[PDB]
């Protein structure tokens with residue numbers, strides 16, 4: 001359904017924390033317009049202790065309330081990946097023309113307030129404070145894998 005690239009800006013600490021932050025910029029690198037409602041991203045990790053989780057988007061270029069989050073299990077589990085968060089967009093989020101990008105700042109946490117070990121997560125990188133192309137967050141358009149490497 002088109003072409004995209006995912007850039008990730010890691011502002012997390014290595015220390016165990018109750019929150020994992022995700023700052024993501026997705027650029028339309030193809031020749032076709034993209035409706036953001038068709039775009040899903042997945043960030044894969046080990047949950048570390050079992051708890052209900054909550055997703056929040058604090059800011060997006062298309063409006064924080066137009067960003068959705070949900071969770072899934074990786075089964076059978078893989079190295080660094082027993083869980084993922086899937087970030088999506090509402091019907092009202094709009095289009096990206098070729099060359100345009102969407103940016104969002106989001107996070108997730110465990111509602112029992114237990115901590116994550118981030119360092120072992122499949123999608124966690126080691127490049128801090130700089131947006132880089134990051135192939136361990138996958139992107140799908142209309143269900144079709146367009147960017148990245150599934151665990």
Ligand SMILES: [Ca+2]
Pocket residue numbers: 045046047048116117118119120121
């Ligand atoms: Ca973990």
